[PDB]
Amino acid sequence: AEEAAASGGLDRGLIAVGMGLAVGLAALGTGVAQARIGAAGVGAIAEDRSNFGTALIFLLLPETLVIFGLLIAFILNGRL
Amino acid sequence: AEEAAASGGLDRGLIAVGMGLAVGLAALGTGVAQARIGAAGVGAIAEDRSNFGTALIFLLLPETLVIFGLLIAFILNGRL
Amino acid sequence: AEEAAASGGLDRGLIAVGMGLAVGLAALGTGVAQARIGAAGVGAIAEDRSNFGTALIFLLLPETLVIFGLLIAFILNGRL
Amino acid sequence: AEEAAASGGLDRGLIAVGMGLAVGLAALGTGVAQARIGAAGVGAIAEDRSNFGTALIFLLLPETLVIFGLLIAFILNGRL
Amino acid sequence: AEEAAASGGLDRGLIAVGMGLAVGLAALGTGVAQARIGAAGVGAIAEDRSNFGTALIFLLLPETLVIFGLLIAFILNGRL
Amino acid sequence: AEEAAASGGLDRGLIAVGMGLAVGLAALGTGVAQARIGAAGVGAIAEDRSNFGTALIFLLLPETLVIFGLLIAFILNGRL
Amino acid sequence: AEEAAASGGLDRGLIAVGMGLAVGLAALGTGVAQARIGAAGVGAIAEDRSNFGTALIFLLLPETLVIFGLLIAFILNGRL
Amino acid sequence: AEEAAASGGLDRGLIAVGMGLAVGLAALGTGVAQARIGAAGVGAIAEDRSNFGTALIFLLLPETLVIFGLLIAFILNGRL
Amino acid sequence: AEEAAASGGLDRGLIAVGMGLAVGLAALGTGVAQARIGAAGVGAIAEDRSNFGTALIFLLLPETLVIFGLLIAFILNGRL
Amino acid sequence: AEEAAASGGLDRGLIAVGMGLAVGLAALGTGVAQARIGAAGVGAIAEDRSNFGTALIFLLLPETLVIFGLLIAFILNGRL
Amino acid sequence: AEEAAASGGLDRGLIAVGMGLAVGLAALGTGVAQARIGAAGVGAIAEDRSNFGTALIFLLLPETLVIFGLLIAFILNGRL
Amino acid sequence: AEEAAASGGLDRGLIAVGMGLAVGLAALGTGVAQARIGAAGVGAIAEDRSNFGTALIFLLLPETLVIFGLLIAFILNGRL
Amino acid sequence: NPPWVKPFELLVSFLNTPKYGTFDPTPVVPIFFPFWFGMIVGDIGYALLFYLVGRWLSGYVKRNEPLVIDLFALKLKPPVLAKLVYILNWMVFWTVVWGLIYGEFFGTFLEHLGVFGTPEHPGLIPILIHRIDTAKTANLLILLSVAFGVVMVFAGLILRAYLGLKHRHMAHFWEGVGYLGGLLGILALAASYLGNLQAGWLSALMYLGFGVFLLSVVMSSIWLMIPEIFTQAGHILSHIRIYAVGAAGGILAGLLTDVGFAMAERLGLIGVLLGIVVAGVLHLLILLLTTLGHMLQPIRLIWVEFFTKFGFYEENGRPYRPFKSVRETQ
Amino acid sequence: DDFAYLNARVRVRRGTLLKESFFQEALDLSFADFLRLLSETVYGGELAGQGLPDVDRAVLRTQAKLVGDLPRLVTGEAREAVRLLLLRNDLHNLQALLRAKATGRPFEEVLLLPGTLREEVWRQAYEAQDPAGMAQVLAVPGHPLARALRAVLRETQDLARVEALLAKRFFEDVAKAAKGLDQPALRDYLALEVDAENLRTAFKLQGSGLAPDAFFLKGGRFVDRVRFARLMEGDYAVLDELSGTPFSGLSGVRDLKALERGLRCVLLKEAKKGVQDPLGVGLVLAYVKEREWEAVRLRLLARRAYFGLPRAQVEEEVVC
């Protein structure tokens, strides 16, 4: 694929389609993963005030996965 | 992709298809994330009025995922 | 042109498939998001009448994903 | 496709597939969001008439998502 | 395509499949959402026999979405 | 629906796939929608033989989607 | 007619593609749906042992949608 | 497909693509339905050892959907 | 048969891909079916260690669908 | 398939697609089912420490599917 | 494809996509599985934190499915 | 490939198609496992700060799966 | 003759006792028999080996643990209970024996040089080739079963109507007569699909006068389940789909024996005879387990009609006992 | 399945939970005025008579229509969950029914209620004299006290012993199911409820004539079978080694009133945070606990108001 414009050639095109699935699936995951700690987290803030930081650090971690994915996708794009 | 609005071939169109996935599922997943956490913030406001604020800030954290999806799609279609 | 065409062509259709995921998936996601956050919200009114206003602001925030998803589809299918 | 009158042509036909995704998914999410509010409303009227209204304003909010999908599909199809 | 379609063939037929999709997803959502509320409703009609009607009436509202999509497809794919 | 030369050909065939869509979507939505309501309800009639009519009329409501999709498909592709 | 791509050309090709989708949706909706009556069904045999026959006829009710969707697809895809 | 290397042609291949959806979705649902009846059933088979067999039969009962998708697919490929 | 376009003909390849969809879906559904039966299986050993055989034969039943499909595909794509 | 993958065939590719389903589903389902036993398993060890071993033989049981994929794998290798 | 050849073509590409399915499934199942044993772990700490050790030892066991799945992909997508 | 040139190959791009399934899926899975472990952590901070250490070791185990999923992709595509 | 008279003798206690204007459930046993017998139609690996399975139940072996002297009624079941189902054990034997013959029926289209090009004797083992792997040959046997299902639909619907005739209840009467209107329309549409170019224009016009007969006296009955007629057609579709599975699934069991007892190794040379058993031992038991599921299709067939009201007691409780407990001894 | 409608009905019903300021105004009231005060609220729509037993019955009728219909209005996974909370009250109901059967005294003078086990099921059980008839009646809904009963009753038919063992097997089975629904609020609630139960059970059942280890239950912290026997003999030196509990500050106390107040107030606050997981059984779990503690409190105030007992004898309990 190319990161810009057209891919040129059918083969370059197919590769664009294929890298799109990966970001997509990782993002969908981020959201659902976040819901499970997020509902719990509110209790973590309420009960363990002293440890309000703990709910927050846990929540940040599935977000890192979607960014990590963009670097993989960015790297393959601009080349075959 | 880039410079697309009624031009480009089958090849360009295929990068638009793939890349569309990233923002779209990311909005989908954002929704889910918000829905469990949001439900818990209501519980929290209900018990203690005073932390109206905690619930609202935490609810803004999965908003970040939807914007994250946008950034991926835009980058991969046209190189910044 | 920018999510707005007439007779159109095959190329505009492939761009359409790609971008159409975003309006849908944003709206889908917003649909799961309002239902949870809102449902705990009917209870906030029932228990403590005064703070009907906390329910309204909660509900309002998942609206931001469906409008953002529609705007992305519009932007993307007509950038330079 | 087009809403201007008729709908034939190959050129329209790709566009028709692509636009259907937004309407499809937007309705899917509206479906889930709405149903729970519809059933709960009867419980509201049955239990206590005076706050029949809360269930009613809640219902309207997923309606917006199905119409946004319709509207995007309608505008693109035949210039409205 | 259809017999009351203003013109037929593959081009009309293509439109028919994609537009058919949208009512299909609508259907998917209505049905799963409806199942949840109907299952709970049985206790309400069982207890409140003289008011069976209210339970019946709650059930119709997500159905509305599926019928509506059927009409839009009907018109678009067939003017007569 | 019908099979013959004049009710089976390639021209006729475009009518048949389009009509075939209708059964398909309705089958999907009714199947899910009927089942959960049907499962709780058959229990209700089974335990109490004095609410037995009530369950049955309730059950019929999701079925409607299949009769309306079948009826459209039958009429249009029963001629050509 | 048949499902082919080279006895009727494109016009034929489109039939094969589209028509498979329908069967697919009907099969999917029943499959998810059956699981709910079966798991619920265990309480009914336990309580009303004497009436095991009423439980069997409830499990049978979702079979009907899928069987219609198969008979129709079977006829339509061998219509010639 | 009874014949999928015992008859050649692109024509035979299209029939397998459309039919393949049917047997595959049907196989998915059947397996799941059994699994759900099976999770519930362990309590019944354990306590009633004078009624474990009602439970075994009930697990078997969803088989009719998968085998029907397989047969209709078997008949149609290699023609009737 | 097998996909080929540089070793055999296209005609064989089209049949192979169509038949593969079916195994494709079925693999998905037995994987999901596996979770529920694994949950249930520990209770059967827990309550009655002495009657392990009844639990293994139960456990055995969704496994059969996938293995059976694999064997069906071996007969069809073993000829060519 | 046949030892070659640097000079391999499109045939070899088809076997690899079909094969990917076997080991992949077996791993997915086995991972989950076994984990379900283990999860249950904390309760199991707790209640009866002495018969921890029975719980373990059950957890190894979904592996048969995994060996089955490999067995298919072995036969299919060296051919086509 | 190969895990040493830095260049290939169409043929090689099919194997690579196909063996890619296996890792995706294995990855899906290990992530979902790890989650169960983790949810279970909260009990382990809580009841008697002497059974915290046991929870860890179950938890290693699903890891084997993703590392194993990578092996199947590795030999097959790089024969010679 | 690399962000720098002198990297990239069609075989490597094709693996990237399939391997994209893995990074997305592994990422989804690592997140959901991680979030449950986060739910355990609310208990780990509340009961024994001193044995906070159990939650950390726990939290580290799901991390393997995304990091692994990521590591396979980079070697197979992004080798040079 | 033992096959009809022996179970027919126990139906005599229910002849003597009628509780409705519908005729007593005596026809039920010969309606059961064709489909029940016809459930085994496998090849060398299934049907023709089934012989052993019959002999255990109606005879006596030591091979199975709780079975010792069946002549003293020793079983899993209680000693009395086993004595009660001697009649059934005989009918299970007749079922297994009719299954062996439909193995030789099966080898009419899978062996002899007078019917197909397949060897009259293979050089390895009988049933080396399968020729019921041709779509059409297999299809005709399916369509044969389907017909028996149309008949059973007619049998039920006469019985539905008869109840109100001799019980003097108009509602059931109106329902049984009006529904047969629907049958003209089932047979019309069917002719067009079974013969293909038989109707399609002679059942689009005629269909219209067939639909009016369907509901004409249903409206005298009132009926405030107008949609429920989709499910009455469905019940028709269920008798078809069950006879169909009994046919297709029947042939399918045997076609899995293609790579099980014939040939699946080497080039199909002579040495596979003593190599095939590698696979044989594994498939056999797997096959056995799934064909036990196929014998439940009969009682599932009776339950559509019996338990959902079409001339019979059952539907939501009601006096008289389920047909399952009746056939259990017969 | 399905909690959506159920949860929605339960939230609307929260609108009529009795507020803290109720019980403030109520303490200053005598009996006649408390009844006038009570009749305004939702228990008031079922209030009858000026006698105390007529009030007790009026509490029961309120509880029937607002809590006891709840397993019936839902099915599948939802019914099992609502059932698990109701099972604990069914366990009071069975023990009382069984005792009326064994000791030959009337059906009357038991506390029944409808839920999983309905009024007629209990009536059927009473009417099945033989232990085998009794055992099968109870197996009809298939509920976990049946499966506990089937195992237990085979060993022994000694009444007091049947009860004790019925409780231990019933709790071993419950602890797993409730931890297993994977709701963190319920699990936290469950560990404290269990720790609390082991303590409370030892105080009540001392001097019964039974085993100590027939009253232990799964979910227990630092407590073990040996410690339970230590407590049943009357030694509070078990509590000075008990720690990690939030109940750690009720340690060192001998006064019955002060200990039970502290256990109960924690569990109240714990359950109330169940609305931070309103999804699922959270919201109904919170609801059941608040409505029970209001009914107890209605009863404490009424008695205090009628008989002229001190304001402080109940004022301390009503504010946690």
Curated annotation (Swiss-Prot), chain N:
Gene3D superfamilies xrefs: ATP synthase (C/AC39) subunit, domain 3 (1.10.132.50), V-type ATP synthase subunit C domain (1.20.1690.10)
Pfam families the UniProt entry points to: vATP-synt_AC39
An example Gene Ontology biological process: proton motive force-driven plasma membrane ATP synthesis
The entry's keywords: ATP synthesis, Hydrogen ion transport, Ion transport, Transport
InterPro entries linked: ATPase_csu/dsu_sf, ATPase_V0-cplx_csu, ATPase_V0-cplx_csu/dsu, V-ATPase_V0D/AC39_subunit, V-type_ATPase_csu/dsu, V-type_ATPase_csu/dsu_dom_3
Gene Ontology MF terms: ATP binding; proton-transporting ATP synthase activity, rotational mechanism; proton-transporting ATPase activity, rotational mechanism
UniProt keyword Transport present: yes
GO cellular component: a single term: proton-transporting V-type ATPase, V0 domain
Function in brief: Produces ATP from ADP in the presence of a proton gradient across the membrane.
Family as reported in the entry's similarity comment: Belongs to the V-ATPase V0D/AC39 subunit family.
Record's protein name: V-type ATP synthase subunit C
Naturally occurring in which organism (per UniProt): Thermus thermophilus (strain ATCC 27634 / DSM 579 / HB8)
